Design a protein around this ligand. Structure first.
Ligand SMILES: NC(=O)c1ccc[n+]([C@@H]2O[C@H](COP(=O)([O-])OP(=O)(O)OC[C@H]3O[C@@H](n4cnc5c(N)ncnc54)[C@H](O)[C@@H]3O)[C@@H](O)[C@H]2O)c1
Ligand SMILES: NC(=O)c1ccc[n+]([C@@H]2O[C@H](COP(=O)([O-])OP(=O)(O)OC[C@H]3O[C@@H](n4cnc5c(N)ncnc54)[C@H](O)[C@@H]3O)[C@@H](O)[C@H]2O)c1
Lengths: 375, 378
């Protein structure tokens, strides 16, 4: 008469949390416990399907990821088995990766970020959060999301062609669709890339094939005035290395990797499961996380661009992941080795900022720092 | 019957500081009206004023101050002969330069994925800057070799090695000598063609002293030949007309700004204020914090022990040398922009302006030794 919850043994905080609801056995991502369990919380490694579950009493499957590729959500729901992913769990990580790249390019190239026009392609978990933060800085942002538009969501949704005409930063946050009216495979092909404004910045931290890597390379090689930030590559793990040499920032598909991010995976699945069994519970994310290296800092004066750059980069400077990828890119095994070995990264909210300036604190909070004003 | 003190009208904090000791009149440094020198008790100058018998003869001036690290514009011997007090500001800008060097090295260590404590640092010239660099590398347990024959010939105590020995055993080589055109200590092109070529594979070469200490032509020649070398340059042969292709090739190139911190610049006036206070029987020490505006980031907490990445984050919160390398690459071949970058140089602070509270006592001890204002808060 209590629930037996199997959790993956390398899933952070899983034992801590799930015991608020039942007995936890930690399985490596083993038959005997499956047939005598009521719930299963997994990571990407475990294919979840009829094969593995049919016949068991398992009544709920949580996956601690934004992704769901490795699960057949369909069969479970067909079967009456509750399911939950952790959508958006890594979203803030990507937004701060994007901000980290932009603030570096803004200093390196002597331009003013508040002056840019930013087109967001895909306004979902990642793009909507990016929109919120760009707006708080008063940066004009153009939104492109034909599905949301078609479905009747509110907002000023423009066409991709419109974004290409008006933006000088273009960032992609769509899924990978290979056909249909919303096809995103090679959404950024030679024709689109070629129309990009002089000095435009192209950012792809979503899925590799959304950008045609060979065409992008060719335009860069012909001298198109264009800056590029890539976190995802066609052909991963065997990226186009020549392309890496021509981009301003390339990293090994680590944009989503923060500590807070891994912990939200476990956290959301906990909350869904707690709701599933009539015991809705929430969890302080700060109760779980170890203190970061730099926890508190004072700020004197207004927030300006260089001040914001020093703040974000104190937490995460994208160049620390760019440099090691350049050192090993054409060596088989190494791309994947940099993901497995990924070093601890925190989010801006882990940093407590004490501002004597009221406006700097208001702005920092809207950017996602834990900022306060000191009268 | 108050002291009359003449101050170069462009020296920072001059009136604020000296009007504590006497009447203070601001004067241009070139030329100084003679009526003024004739009624003055003390003169505080910058490098534009040649101080010698022609300037001071027959005047009542009993002390000369120069808010300046160097003493080329001053006839010190003559001042001794005449009984006139003198003070420069030796080392006023040394910490600026050292924190600049650390900024560059911490950037390269991350970029290239090496640990600092696996590098051997040869310091050439071990005076005000060289010996501060030493202290700090040694506090980090980084192996350093010292080269400074003028100190060895004086019989100074230390492990003084020859230049050539540094070239065999060091993979970081950094120059802090003045420029001597000849004599036994000639530093002109001290790092020439032959010397550069012998630098260990993966070597890092830094020059933040005087442009012509390193043969820029030879260096470019080696780089073009494909020698695995890293180069950090803040000073250049033929400034402001630097070798542009040598710029495109170095890892970091900045526009002779290594010494430019608010602290460096205010310390010229400070050390001279201090020396003069003592000279007239009013020994007075003055703390920079009460003169300089408060810094943007004045306090931060550090949880746990220091490691290299943590130290890089701290040094670069304060000063990331890349912020000076980037503007120079944008405008290097445009005649006049180099001087314009120095003229409008934006505020830079020293590590001592960051107050660091560490829950690890050994992190505190170390950061303190490194020049942060670090304190253990259990
Ligand atoms: N780089 C990383 O480490 C990492 C981390 C997190 C997410 N991602 C990827 O980034 C992408 C965005 O993630 P998310 O969490 O926001 O997912 P999401 O499902 O919340 O949002 C995707 C949005 O794109 C929109 N979209 C679909 N087709 C489009 C089209 N053709 N043109 C414009 N918009 C379109 C959808 O309507 C949806 O609003 C996904 O591909 C995700 O897998 C990568
Ligand atoms: N880049 C900048 O913005 C900047 C700022 C400050 C100082 N500097 C320069 O850096 C140099 C160091 O300044 P400092 O305050 O340490 O001066 P310093 O006089 O205290 O140091 C010079 C040291 O070098 C030694 N030396 C002389 N000739 C040598 C040689 N042949 N080989 C090895 N050592 C030799 C001397 O014995 C002395 O110890 C100065 O020349 C100064 O002009 C540059």
């Amino acid at each position: 008469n209590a629930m037996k919850i199997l959790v993956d043994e390398n899933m952070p905080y899983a034992r801590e949390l799930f015991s608020r609801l039942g007995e936890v056995k930690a399985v490596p991502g083993p038959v005997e416990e499956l047939n005598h369990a009521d719930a299963l919380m997994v990571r990407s490694v475990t294919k979840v399907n009829e094969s593995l579950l049919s016949g068991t009493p398992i009544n709920f499957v949580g996956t601690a990821t934004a992704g769901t590729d490795h699960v057949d959500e369909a069969w479970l729901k067909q079967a009456g088995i509750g399911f939950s992913a952790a959508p958006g769990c890594n979203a803030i990580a990507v937004v701060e990766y994007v901000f980290s790249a932009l603030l570096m390019l803004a200093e390196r190239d002597g331009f003013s970020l508040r002056d840019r026009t930013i087109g967001i392609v895909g306004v979902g978990n990642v793009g909507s959060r990016l929109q919120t933060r760009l707006e708080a800085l008063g940066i004009r942002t153009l939104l492109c999301d034909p599905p949301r538009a078609a479905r009747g969501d509110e907002g000023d949704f423009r066409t991709l062609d419109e974004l290409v005409q008006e933006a000088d930063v273009l960032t992609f946050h769509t899924p990978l669709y290979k056909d249909g009216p919303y096809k995103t495979l090679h959404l950024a092909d030679e024709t689109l890339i070629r129309r990009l404004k002089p000095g435009a910045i192209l950012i792809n931290a979503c899925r590799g094939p959304v950008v045609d890597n060979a065409a992008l390379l060719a335009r860069l090689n012909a001298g198109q005035p264009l800056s590029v930030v890539l976190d995802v590559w066609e052909g991963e793990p065997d990226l186009n290395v020549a392309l890496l040499e021509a981009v301003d920032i390339g990293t090994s598909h680590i944009a989503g990797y923060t500590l807070e991010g891994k912990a939200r995976g476990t956290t959301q699945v906990f909350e869904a499961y707690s709701a599933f069994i009539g015991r809705e519970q929430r969890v302080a994310l700060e109760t779980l996380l170890p203190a970061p290296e730099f926890g508190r800092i004072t700020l004197h004066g207004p927030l300006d661009q260089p001040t914001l750059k020093r703040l974000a980069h104190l937490v995460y400077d994208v160049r620390r992941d760019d440099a090691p990828l350049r050192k090993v890119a054409g060596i088989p095994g190494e791309f994947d080795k940099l993901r497995k070995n990924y070093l601890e990264r925190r989010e801006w909210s882990s940093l407590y900022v004490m501002c004597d300036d009221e406006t700097a604190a208001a702005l920092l909070c809207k950017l996602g720092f834990n900022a306060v004003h000191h009268p």
